[PDB]
C-alpha cells in the first residue's frame, strides 16, 4: 500500500509532526522517520534507507544546501525541497534545484496564509513524482557552449518551450549556450508565484541572452527569453504586424496555470511556421495536443529524449500524439532548436 518511505528533515518539532501526519494520510505513502538537522538526516537515511528526502532548508546552523551538496555527490536519492517564497526562500530554494532537488512544495512559514488540504495534496503528488524521477538524469553535466555565433532573423521566427519537474534546469540548458542574436524564446515553466521572477532572474545572469519574466503587452524580440509569471497563463500575441507577449488570467489548462497548452496552442496561431517548439522534462501531458497543434500549423518540434529527462511524461504524450518532429537529447536541443529556427522561411 504505503510503499513509499519518506523521511524529513526539519529542525521544528510541530513542522515535523505535521509532515508526518500529513504524509501518513495517503495510502501509498508512510513517514520512517524525521531529522532535525544535517548530521541525524544522514545518519537517519543510512539506518532507514528511505525512498524519499523532505528538505526544509530554513534552519541556521550547516543547512541543506551543503549536506543535500553532498547527499547528491556521495550516492544520491530523491528529494523535495519546501520553500518559503519569501525572497531568500526563492534563491535558497533555487539553489537545491540547481544542486538536485527533483521539485519543491511552498508554506509560508506555516500552513499560514493558506490552506492544509491543498498543501497535503501538494506534498503527496510532489513526493510520487520524486519517487518515480530519473535520479540519473541530474548526473552533474557540462552544459553545452555549442552554439554560439551568428546574425539576426527576422522578427517573425520566434521558440516557445514548455517544461515542469525538472525543467529549471534543463532551461538552462537550453537557454545557456543561445548567443545574443538568438530569435525570441518564450516559455512556460510550470511554477507558483514569485518563484518564476527569481528563476528569470537566475538565467539573466547565467545567460548572455536577456531573461526576464514576460509581462502583458511587451513587444517579442531577438535576444530574449520570457518566463511565464506564475498563476497565470502567457500567450503570444499580435498586434499590427508584430508579436507581444500577453498575460491572462483564464482558468488552468490541464490544472495548470501558466499552462504548456495555452501558450503553444497562441503560437499555433500567430507564428505558424515561423516558429520551433520544444517540450522538455515533466509530468502529465501539459503540452502534448498544444504541440501538435504547432507541428499542424508548420512548425518544427523537439521532445526531450527519456534517458535526459528527470521526468519524461510531457515529452512521451507530445510524441504519442505525433505531434513532434525529433526527439534530441538535452545536450543538444540548444544547437538543434537554433539551427531549426535558422533554416529559411524569411525568404
Not at 513517514?31 to 544522514?42: G, K, Q
Not at 525572497?87 to 535558497?92: D, L
Not at 510532489?126 to 532573423?153: C, D, E, N, W
Request: aromatic share 4%; with cysteine.
Amino acid at each position: 500500500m504505503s510503499k513509499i518511505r519518506v523521511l524529513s528533515v526539519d529542525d521544528s518539532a510541530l513542522m515535523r509532526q505535521i509532515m508526518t501526519e500529513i504524509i501518513n494520510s495517503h495510502s501509498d505513502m508512510e513517514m520512517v522517520a524525521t531529522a532535525p538537522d544535517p548530521l541525524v538526516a544522514r545518519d537517519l537515511i543510512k539506518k532507514f534507507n528511505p525512498d524519499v528526502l523532505t528538505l526544509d532548508v530554513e534552519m541556521p546552523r550547516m543547512d541543506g544546501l551543503d549536506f543535500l551538496e553532498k547527499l547528491m555527490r556521495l550516492r544520491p536519492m530523491p528529494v523535495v525541497m519546501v520553500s518559503s517564497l519569501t525572497g531568500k526562500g526563492s534563491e535558497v530554494t533555487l539553489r537545491a534545484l540547481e544542486l538536485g532537488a527533483i521539485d519543491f512544495v511552498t508554506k509560508p512559514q506555516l500552513g499560514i496564509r493558506e490552506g492544509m488540504l491543498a498543501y497535503s495534496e501538494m506534498i503527496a503528488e510532489k513526493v510520487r513524482t520524486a519517487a518515480r524521477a530519473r535520479i540519473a538524469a541530474h548526473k552533474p553535466m557540462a552544459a553545452p557552449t555549442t552554439l554560439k555565433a551568428g546574425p539576426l532573423l527576422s522578427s517573425e521566427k520566434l521558440i516557445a518551450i514548455g517544461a515542469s519537474t525538472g525543467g529549471t534546469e534543463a532551461i538552462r540548458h537550453v537557454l545557456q549556450p543561445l548567443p545574443l542574436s538568438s530569435p525570441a524564446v518564450i516559455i512556460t515553466q510550470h511554477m507558483p508565484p514569485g518563484f518564476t521572477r527569481s528563476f528569470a532572474e537566475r538565467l539573466n545572469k547565467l545567460c548572455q541572452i536577456s531573461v526576464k519574466e514576460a509581462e502583458d503587452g511587451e513587444r517579442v524580440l531577438p535576444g530574449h527569453a520570457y518566463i511565464a509569471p506564475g498563476d497565470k497563463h502567457m500567450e503570444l500575441a499580435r498586434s499590427g504586424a508584430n508579436y507581444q507577449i500577453k498575460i491572462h488570467d483564464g482558468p488552468p489548462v490541464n490544472r495548470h496555470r501558466p499552462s504548456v497548452d495555452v501558450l503553444f496552442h497562441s503560437v499555433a496561431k500567430h507564428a505558424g511556421r515561423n516558429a520551433v517548439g520544444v517540450i522538455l522534462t515533466g509530468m502529465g501531458n501539459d503540452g502534448a495536443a498544444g504541440m501538435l497543434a504547432m507541428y499542424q500549423a508548420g512548425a518544427w518540434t523537439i521532445a526531450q529524449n527519456e534517458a535526459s529527462c528527470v521526468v519524461f511524461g510531457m515529452p512521451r504524450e507530445a510524441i504519442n500524439m505525433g505531434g513532434v518532429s525529433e526527439v534530441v537529447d538535452l545536450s543538444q536541443v540548444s544547437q538543434q532548436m537554433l539551427a531549426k529556427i535558422s533554416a529559411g522561411q524569411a525568404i
